Protein: T cell surface glycoprotein CD4
Organism: Homo sapiens
Amino acid sequence: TKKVVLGKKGDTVELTCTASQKKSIQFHWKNSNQIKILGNQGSFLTKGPSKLNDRADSRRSLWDQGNFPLIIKNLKIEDSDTYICEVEDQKEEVQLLVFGLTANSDTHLLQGQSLTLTLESPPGSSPSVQCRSPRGKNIQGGKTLSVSQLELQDSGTWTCTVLQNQKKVEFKIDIVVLA
Amino acid sequence: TKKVVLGKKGDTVELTCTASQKKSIQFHWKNSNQIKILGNQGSFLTKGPSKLNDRADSRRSLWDQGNFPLIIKNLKIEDSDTYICEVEDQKEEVQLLVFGLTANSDTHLLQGQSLTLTLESPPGSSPSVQCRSPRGKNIQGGKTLSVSQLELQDSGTWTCTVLQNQKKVEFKIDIVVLA
């Protein structure tokens, strides 16, 4: 059933899948594109064929609790698919939405200078961005945000919030303004 | 409901607890001795008072999936209690059984020398041990196992299996025999 996960570019993410049938059993994880990344073969975790192969995981450790995660390390925006956990006779449907958030300028600005933060995302993503400032000021945005010209006081870690469904991803860039 | 976890002395363990009610909510974890170790205060994880305080955890990261683990790092036999996950109106009852497995001799033995492996455990533990040898030989035991005298060939990583309920813990000690 339709559970969503929003992740962050570079950061690591984990999708939940629970059995609750006799405790240590066999599962599968596949991308909507029907190809699998993982399952436990015997007592072996096989990573069939996939872009993620060198990057996907699970914890052997919890399989006895009927917990069969999918750990996708070092995220790419692109990894933004529908993934499916498979346990004997049931499917878990969880989608990941990979975000990025640039400073197509830098962090080491100057008084008067403008600033442009840009939102990297998978398509199908209908995010609403809200960056707040070092001394609490909004900045509404689409896929591109812009600070006309900043001045001394808003030196500090800004806070962005890629607000999508309930689930939201907050980002923190530190900004340096000088003169 | 009565779920069990067998852990290993020193090693790290994780107890599973899942909600499945509106996705990001408030939980608690307490030892049968009724005192809590953790819960999420607001969006803060408070570690009340406990032996484990400096050692207990959870992943903030999955609370949005209704997953409220209990990560107890660096295990002590003693940490062998009944722990309870608490979510609004329900309890998860999971017990951890902390094991240890010594070589009250060493690893660097000699031909003819005897060997004694000893099982560290919480009381209430009704384990059945089975150590196999480097060239597959049993050794049944209670809380103490003994190799009369070993000879050259059983140099290698032995495999013990603290077999309790379904759930079992396997251990591997490497043995060196010389002459």
